[PDB]
Amino acid sequence: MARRPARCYRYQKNKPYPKSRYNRAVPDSKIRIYDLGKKKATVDEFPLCVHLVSNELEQLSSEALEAARICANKYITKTVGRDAFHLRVRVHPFHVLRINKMLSCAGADRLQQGMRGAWGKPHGLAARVDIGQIIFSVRCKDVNKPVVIEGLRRARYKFPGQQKIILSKKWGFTNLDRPEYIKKRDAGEIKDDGAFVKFLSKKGSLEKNYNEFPEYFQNLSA
Amino acid sequence: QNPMRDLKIEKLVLNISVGESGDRLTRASKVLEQLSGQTPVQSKARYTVRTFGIRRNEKIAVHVTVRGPKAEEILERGLKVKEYQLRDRNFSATGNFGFGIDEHIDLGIKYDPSIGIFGMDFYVVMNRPGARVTRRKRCKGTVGNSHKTTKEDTVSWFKQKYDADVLDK
Amino acid sequence: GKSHGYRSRTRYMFQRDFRKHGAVHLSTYLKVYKVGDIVDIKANGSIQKGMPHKFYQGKTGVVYNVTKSSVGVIINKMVGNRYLEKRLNLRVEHIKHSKCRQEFLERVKANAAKRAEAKAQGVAVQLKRQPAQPRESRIVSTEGNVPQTLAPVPYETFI
Amino acid sequence: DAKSSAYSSRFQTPFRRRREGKTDYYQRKRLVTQHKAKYNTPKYRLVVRFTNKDIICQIISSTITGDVVLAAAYSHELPRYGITHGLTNWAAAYATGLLIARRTLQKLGLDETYKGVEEVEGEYELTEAVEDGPRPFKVFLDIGLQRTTTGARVFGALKGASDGGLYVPHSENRFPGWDFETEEIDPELLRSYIFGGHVSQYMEELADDDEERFSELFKGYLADDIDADSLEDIYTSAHEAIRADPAFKPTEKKFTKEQYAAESKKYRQTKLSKEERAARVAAKIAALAGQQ
Amino acid sequence: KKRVFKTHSYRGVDLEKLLEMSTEDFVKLAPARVRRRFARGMTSKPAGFMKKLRAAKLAAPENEKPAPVRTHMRNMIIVPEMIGSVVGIYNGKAFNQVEIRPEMLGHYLGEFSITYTPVRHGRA
RNA sequence: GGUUGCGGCCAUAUCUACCAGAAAGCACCGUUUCCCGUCCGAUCAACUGUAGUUAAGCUGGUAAGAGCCUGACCGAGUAGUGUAGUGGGUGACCAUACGCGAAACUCAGGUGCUGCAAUCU
RNA sequence: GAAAUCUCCAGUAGAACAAAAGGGUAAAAGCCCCCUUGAUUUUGAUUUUCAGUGUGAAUACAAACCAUGAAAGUGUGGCC
RNA sequence: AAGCGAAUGAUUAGAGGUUCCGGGGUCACCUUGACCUAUUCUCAAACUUUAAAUAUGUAAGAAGUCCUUGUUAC
């Protein structure tokens, strides 16, 4: 069947209806890959973190995320190469939209009842977003900043509503502000773990804290 | 060191398998009755797999447990067939170990007719005095780590007894 | 169709609290209930024999009957334009004493106590409670406490 | 073995006296609950316990904030009554059973009546309420976690208490000397248990057969040179002695409880403070990072 | 695994003594069939086989089995100087290696080298 | 102040590692005549407190311990929400006025407390 | 042999509780074992649906007689 | 509302660790097929630790409080 226009399912009209054992017969989401670019770079390689944040409360159709993801990748890749960035599609397609299946054939009024038992069958998936929630997060080196904003600008155009390109003060995908993460990385409380980093807590078994973070204890002692 | 931290023989369990039921369980039970001097029990199959002709609660296994000086003695006479030597395998991480033989009918006593030949299995269950703390009805607790049994203590305990060496292979 | 069974819509009213499942603490059967006591109803779901209906959970009423293992509680009920009287067969596992009434009772002993001394000296001992009166005047000094000014903070994304 | 946080975070620990295993709350609900038409009439529990080298029997009423004890007659007090060697056998349980009976009856003002059984043949004779007299003190046996089994020591105390006049509801099924063909307790066999005949017959049969076991064991007996048939005498003498004066007195004691506390405090391991807790981590952080 | 309820003896030769003797003295206690074989003359047919065995035995210490040697001469006898060693025996394919034990002593070599795959009938 | 029997609140008590335990007590522990029970005196039952013994159990302590329990002007007066507006906004929703006001997070603590009885260097 | 039976350790319940789902349950409401018929009689009161009618179902009792348990107690059908 | 470095259900990305219950490549041989652990993203009407606002039960006495001692087959 022809895909219904996104104008119909724009708003958060219905309560969440996710894939569960009560929601059995549903198709799969169009978006499957959520992390793109040089996704396995360490945290320091990509200091700057940019977010594409929705300013309104609507539903992002699952495939609209896939549609914007290919566009955001494609400008970014061809401008600064394959591995100059790492974009993460934060929000996920869990809300399963419903379609009431209809017959529009000649004289379909006979074979179909209209609104009797009009509970809709699953039509697709969409991502529920509220105001201020991040849609896209790209992390890259700071000189790449013009490219990622423009690349995010092209991705904004696949989304309904208004979205904002905000230059987050955090150090990449971390939860730490730039000047004070530098203090933390310098003091040596940070071990990479493939793509993200480990923090040393003031609480814990000191022997394990020593196992993971020998450099902190050496740095203080020295 | 401390006398009752030393390992001691606590229970030896002896089991077999007989897929079907009938007169084969009589001989498979009279072999243990003559051997251990005490009647065993016929454990009933918890499930049916149908890959063995076994139905539920079919009494497909005969097993007995022996403890005390008889248990050591039957083990003493049960390691002659094992040459008082053993493999590094067969040792559980909890300090128990075992082995299986294939005949004890005319190995134990003179063969009598209509008893046949059956393979017999041993599982030595060793731990130290004080094991009642996890078996008493009242104030049931646990045992300290120093009081636990590992592979290290039992293999060492298996050296000075039987003049046995482990990892024969 | 539609169901209105004896215990419908009780997915969470008869759940035992977190880490509070299992045995009821033994003080429950030890509390003594006398006819006239004011008790509330909180049906611990663990005990299935003698549960109240889900309407009475939280409803506080007097005890009119005391039985071997149960007590009889009177609860007023909203039915149309009138309150009805509902006498309930309640196992003591589902009830506890109301702490509201005992607060009033201990106050009565406090009122009687201070009225007793008022009989000797100090007439007009002001029995009745007083709500929070408007606060009286006071002097607010500034020794070491100069009023430090504040300014509204500029908007920052903080993200 | 290396549990996760989720297990520890959602773990519902049972009540402390169940974690230690000493208390069975399933029975305690139906031993401490009261017919509410009997509002403030505490239910008395004949608590019997078996430590090693002693017997502990008590009368306990469960109040709101805990359990108060009417009288607690342990078995390590039988030496003052006459029985010295052997403080756990079946006869010892019966003797302390009658002791805890007479102690509380003499305490609640019912000594003059309810004399229990004077001449004890071990018959199932429950103390019937005397006409125009206060009802017999009804206590309820609470064995605890021990197993009900025919010829058990805990039911030895039970028969001892009821035979002491303290009317405790029970039945003859679990008394020793039980017959599965006829539902009767053998008077000859049961009274033998009362006077410790089972111990006595074991001794004299050991002496008949061997000497080593009879000597290695019962070497408390050997010091006083008491015959196996002399056990009945000392038990019957103590039974009358218990009837004579069960009022009890606490032991004389040495080093008053203040000295008890003072000496125990030094050897008892004390607990550190937060500053000390923060002090020693500096030593550990220095040791584990001091040019390591 | 050598010492059991009773140490096996061959023709009155104890198990420990069964580990000692050479080739020549075994003909006294050997059956006629193998005795006739040696009587007619063992002319260096096992010697080249027999020397490499001692090389393998010495090179292999305890904690592990000796290296599997191999041959084809099904007609060879079990001789005490092959004792405690494993050899594969040719049969056409896929040499089958057998440890040589004192209870194996004095028999032929071709009773292990099953040259034909046993015939299986039925559903399988 | 320790121990035991019975407990009240039911992790501040739980859990995982290590250390310590004078006296008493607890327990481990020793043996199967009787009772009783089990494939098995391992459970239970009986009997000796005797052969020993802190190795356990148990109790206490230790851990920048997890957890759990408190607080905090830490988050946060945030989210949310009751009321009102001929408030803004195409709408989505949002701000405001009068109120109430979290949770996660972070930090700072703590790791059982008692009740009856007996007992203990 | 992944899966025949045995043994041990960890095992907050991730199993089972006739049957839909939910709630509830650890010396148990689960598995095994012993005894039993209370799944009985007389009625009445009470709760839910509600007109505070009936039916249904259920709670507490009393008078009885029984069952079990050592007893407390539990049991007037199925844990609800 | 909030929560998943908390239970069940989902879920994206990686990082570190295996019995002869699979190395598929030289016999125990690096050997890409696991699950487990410490993280990371996003969720839930038929999930939840926790948990509002509003609404909601009761009480705020003289039919009560205190003292003395009479009835009862309970």
UniProtKB/Swiss-Prot annotation, chain C:
Annotated source species: Saccharomyces cerevisiae (strain ATCC 204508 / S288c) (Baker's yeast)
Protein location: Cytoplasm
Superkingdom in the source lineage: Eukaryota
Identification of the protein by name: Large ribosomal subunit protein eL21A
Family listed: Belongs to the eukaryotic ribosomal protein eL21 family.
Assembly with partners or alone: Component of the large ribosomal subunit (LSU). Mature yeast ribosomes consist of a small (40S) and a large (60S) subunit. The 40S small subunit contains 1 molecule of ribosomal RNA (18S rRNA) and 33 different proteins (encoded by 57 genes). The large 60S subunit contains 3 rRNA molecules (25S, 5.8S and 5S rRNA) and 46 different proteins (encoded by 81 genes).
Gene that specifies this protein: RPL21A
Signal peptide as annotated in the record: none
Family matches, as SUPFAM superfamilies: Translation proteins SH3-like domain (SSF50104)
